[PDB]
Amino acid sequence: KKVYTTPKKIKHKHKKVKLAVLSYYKVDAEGKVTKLRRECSNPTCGAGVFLANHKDRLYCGKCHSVYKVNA
Amino acid sequence: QPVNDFIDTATRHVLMRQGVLGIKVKIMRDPAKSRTGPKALPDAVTIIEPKEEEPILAPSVKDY
RNA sequence: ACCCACUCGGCACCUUACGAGAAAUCAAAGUCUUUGGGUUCUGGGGGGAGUAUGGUCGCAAGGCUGAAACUUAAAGGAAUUGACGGAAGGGCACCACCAGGAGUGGAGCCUGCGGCUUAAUUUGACUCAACACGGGGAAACUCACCAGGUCCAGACACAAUAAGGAUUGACAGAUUGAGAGCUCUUUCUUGAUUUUGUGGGUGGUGGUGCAUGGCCGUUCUUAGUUGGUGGAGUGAUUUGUCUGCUUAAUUGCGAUAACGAACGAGACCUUAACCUACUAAAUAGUGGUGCUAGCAUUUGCUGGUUAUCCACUUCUUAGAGGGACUAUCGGUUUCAAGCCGAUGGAAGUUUGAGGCAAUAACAGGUCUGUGAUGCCCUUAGACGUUCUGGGCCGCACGCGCGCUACACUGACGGAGCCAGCGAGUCUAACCUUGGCCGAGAGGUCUUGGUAAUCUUGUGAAACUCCGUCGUGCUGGGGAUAGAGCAUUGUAAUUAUUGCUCUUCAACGAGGAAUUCCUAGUAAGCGCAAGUCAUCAGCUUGCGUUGAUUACGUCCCUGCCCUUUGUACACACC
Numbered sequence: 238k239k240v241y242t243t244p245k246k247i248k249h250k251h252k253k254v255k256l257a258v259l260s261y262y263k264v265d266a267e268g269k270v271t272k273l274r275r276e277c278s279n280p281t282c283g284a285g286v287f288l289a290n291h292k293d294r295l296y297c298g299k300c301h302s303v304y305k306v307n308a
Numbered sequence: 309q310p311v312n313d314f315i316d317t318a319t320r321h322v323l324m325r326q327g328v329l330g331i332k333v334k335i336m337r338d339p340a341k342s343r344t345g346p347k348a349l350p351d352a353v354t355i356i357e358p359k360e361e362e363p364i365l366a367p368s369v370k371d372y
Numbered sequence: 373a374c375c376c377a378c379u380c381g382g383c384a385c386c387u388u389a390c391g392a393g394a395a396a397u398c399a400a401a402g403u404c405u406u407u408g409g410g411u412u413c414u415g416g417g418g419g420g421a422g423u424a425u426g427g428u429c430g431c432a433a434g435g436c437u438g439a440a441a442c443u444u445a446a447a448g449g450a451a452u453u454g455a456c457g458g459a460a461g462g463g464c465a466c467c468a469c470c471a472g473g474a475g476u477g478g479a480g481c482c483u484g485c486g487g488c489u490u491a492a493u494u495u496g497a498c499u500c501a502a503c504a505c506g507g508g509g510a511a512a513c514u515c516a517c518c519a520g521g522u523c524c525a526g527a528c529a530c531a532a533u534a535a536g537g538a539u540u541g542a543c544a545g546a547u548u549g550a551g552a553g554c555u556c557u558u559u560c561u562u563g564a565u566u567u568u569g570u571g572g573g574u575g576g577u578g579g580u581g582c583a584u585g586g587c588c589g590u591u592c593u594u595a596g597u598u599g600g601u602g603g604a605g606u607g608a609u610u611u612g613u614c615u616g617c618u619u620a621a622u623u624g625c626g627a628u629a630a631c632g633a634a635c636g637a638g639a640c641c642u643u644a645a646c647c648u649a650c651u652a653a654a655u656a657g658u659g660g661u662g663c664u665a666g667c668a669u670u671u672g673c674u675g676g677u678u679a680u681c682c683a684c685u686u687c688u689u690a691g692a693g694g695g696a697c698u699a700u701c702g703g704u705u706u707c708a709a710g711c712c713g714a715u716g717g718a719a720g721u722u723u724g725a726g727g728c729a730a731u732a733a734c735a736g737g738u739c740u741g742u743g744a745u746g747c748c749c750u751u752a753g754a755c756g757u758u759c760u761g762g763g764c765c766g767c768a769c770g771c772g773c774g775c776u777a778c779a780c781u782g783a784c785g786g787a788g789c790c791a792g793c794g795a796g797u798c799u800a801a802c803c804u805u806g807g808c809c810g811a812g813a814g815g816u817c818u819u820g821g822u823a824a825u826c827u828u829g830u831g832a833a834a835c836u837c838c839g840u841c842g843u844g845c846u847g848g849g850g851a852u853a854g855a856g857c858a859u860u861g862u863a864a865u866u867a868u869u870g871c872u873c874u875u876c877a878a879c880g881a882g883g884a885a886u887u888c889c890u891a892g893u894a895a896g897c898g899c900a901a902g903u904c905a906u907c908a909g910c911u912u913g914c915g916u917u918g919a920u921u922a923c924g925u926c927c928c929u930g931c932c933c934u935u936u937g938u939a940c941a942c943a944c945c
């Protein structure tokens with residue numbers, strides 16, 4: 238046939254990060270808990286799921302993409 | 309046509325290790341028993357065997 | 373000199389074989405395991421090799437005598453069956469000629485193949501038996517090729533990471549051809565489905581058709597293949613299965629150490645021809661009758677009316693039968709199979725045309741039809757797959773099949789106006805009548821049909837008639853090209869197709885060569901079907917119009933058959 242070509246630079250993939258994560262949750266001196274990052278008004282995502290903080294932009298990750306709830 | 313009538317055929321492909329070989333079977337059934345079709349080859353020409361007779365005998369006639 | 377009979381001794385031939393032999397053959401090659409008349413000479417697997425050496429003869433060239441080491445499983449004989457020949461004798465055939473027809477070869481274009489060009493211009497196939505073939509008419513698809521972009525649809529097993537999260541997704545932006553979270557920024561989400569590794573799988577229009585199956589094509593427009601009982605032979609084998617004649621045919625007659633059979637040919641089956649005989653039909657049609665139009669009128673002639681009624685089956689349809697067997701007669705013949713002529717017949721070339729089709733062969737073609745397949749290759753920056761765009765169409769040129777023409781047996785315009793084989797829409801947009809609108813292509817509104825019911829009498833084309841043009845590249849011819857409309861489609865640019873105006877080429881019958889064909893055939897003519905969203909200059913069938921010339925031969929070419937040679941048998945590659 239031929240085999241091999243390329244101008245170099247093969248594409249990587251996706252790492253999907255790490256994070257020890259669920260810290261966003263402040264709870265006082267025994268023991269009142271107040272959430273951080275506001276949750277999702279879309280009744281298909283029962284308010285456990287949170288919106289991410291970008292610029293403008295609060296975004297429902299669980300709504301796999303859906304809905305731009307922004308304040 | 310008797311082909312259509314009388315011979316059954318079949319090819320099967322037996323798949324082995326070194327390669328794959330083919331079987332071809334061809335049975336032909338006795339037309340004398342056909343149960344439902346021609347009972348012989350289109351070739352068959354049976355002649356019926358004549359009876360030996362004792363002729364002669366001057367006339368005569370029998371009443372009933 | 374000749375003729376006849378016998379007899380010695382010669383050169384040979386014939387026929388047999390008691391007999392001999394591995395046979396071919398042999399009056400000796402006989403009288404040999406039932407082995408002895410006398411005597412001479414030579415051989416003891418094949419090469420090495422008639423070589424080395426010594427002797428001897430010769431002017432020489434060379435003669436006579438004449439080893440070994442080493443190597444090797446065969447070399448050799450006669451006969452059989454094959455296969456093959458550049459021999460010989462017969463045949464058979466419009467993929468052969470004869471006698472002719474219509475042509476291709478010249479031209480414009482269509483289309484395949486080469487070549488060249490190219491990012492790529494995917495690939496198979498190259499004498500008949502590659503080149504309008506792969507059903508191959510590729511705009512996406514197809515698709516295999518090229519420029520790029522995603523995805524895993526990487527089974528299962530072990531191991532690792534790992535609920536403090538193995539892994540999955542994403543809006544916007546950036547990015548990108550792109551409203552691909554491809555990748556990146558950012559930071560939510562998902563929860564044991566993955567991810568990493570090794571092993572093992574898996575797909576692949578990747579290779580290999582010279583590893584295979586299956587299918588196909590070719591030999592083959594051919595006529596060959598085998599067994600029982602008998603004959604010959606130690607045997608493989610042979611004869612039967614053959615000089616001739618005959619046939620499309622190993623089809624038969626006949627000849628005959630053969631007799632009588634089976635496969636293949638024939639038979640058989642399918643289709644086209646004949647049935648006023650049989651069984652029927654509002655999904656086929658006729659006559660009568662009503663209801664009714666037109667012209668005549670003297671009753672007539674010509675139409676209308678999916679059931680206003682009666683009757684029939686000629687025409688149409690398809691079931692069951694019947695028919696033909698080359699019949700009768702006459703020629704010719706080994707008075708045999710047959711062949712020829714006449715009469716009759718729907719039919720008398722295997723009735724015409726097909727389907728089927730023994731044994732065997734080929735390194736024919738096909739892994740690019742297959743979830744048929746061995747082995748090889750590759751498998752995540754893929755040769756998996758999909759998505760975007762290009763390409764198979766590219767153009768100094770060589771080859772093949774084709775279409776259209778070079779006009780007056782015509783072109784054009786009006787007018788007559790006649791087929792057959794087909795096909796059509798359910799979970800759908802197929803075949804389309806009629807009415808409108810449109811110069812046209814087309815549009816629009818309705819409609820019949822899952823169909824002998826509707827499209828469709830498919831009112832098809834050549835062809836027929838009355839005109840116009842008048843031999844001038846002419847009004848023959850219609851390539852090339854401009855401009856506009858419209859249809860299929862997501863898409864039409866490299867112009868899918870269709871219409872219109874214009875533009876108006878080559879080609880004045882074609883060198884050497886070469887193809888096809890014998891009666892409803894050749895040729896001319898269009899149609900339906902396959903392909904198909906759209907596209908036929910292709911194919912498969914079909915009907916329409918309808919000839920000239922053979923009814924022969926072996927000259928060319930191709931094949932088959934005997935005979936014959938062989939040291940070939942992996943069989944002349």
Ligand SMILES: [Mg+2]
Pocket residue numbers: none
């Ligand atoms: Mg050996």
Ligand SMILES: [Mg+2]
Pocket residue numbers: none
């Ligand atoms: Mg000629």
Ligand SMILES: [Mg+2]
Pocket residue numbers: none
């Ligand atoms: Mg000619």
Ligand SMILES: [Mg+2]
Pocket residue numbers: none
């Ligand atoms: Mg593509």
Ligand SMILES: [Mg+2]
Pocket residue numbers: none
């Ligand atoms: Mg793995």
Ligand SMILES: [Mg+2]
Pocket residue numbers: none
């Ligand atoms: Mg591996």
Ligand SMILES: [Mg+2]
Pocket residue numbers: none
């Ligand atoms: Mg495959």
Ligand SMILES: [Mg+2]
Pocket residue numbers: 581735
């Ligand atoms: Mg082959």
Ligand SMILES: [Mg+2]
Pocket residue numbers: none
């Ligand atoms: Mg094969």
Ligand SMILES: [Mg+2]
Pocket residue numbers: none
């Ligand atoms: Mg090859």
Ligand SMILES: [Mg+2]
Pocket residue numbers: 593
């Ligand atoms: Mg012929």
Ligand SMILES: [Mg+2]
Pocket residue numbers: none
């Ligand atoms: Mg014997």
Ligand SMILES: [Mg+2]
Pocket residue numbers: 613
């Ligand atoms: Mg013979």
Ligand SMILES: [Mg+2]
Pocket residue numbers: none
């Ligand atoms: Mg009838």
Ligand SMILES: [Mg+2]
Pocket residue numbers: none
């Ligand atoms: Mg006659």
Ligand SMILES: [Mg+2]
Pocket residue numbers: 735
């Ligand atoms: Mg080959």
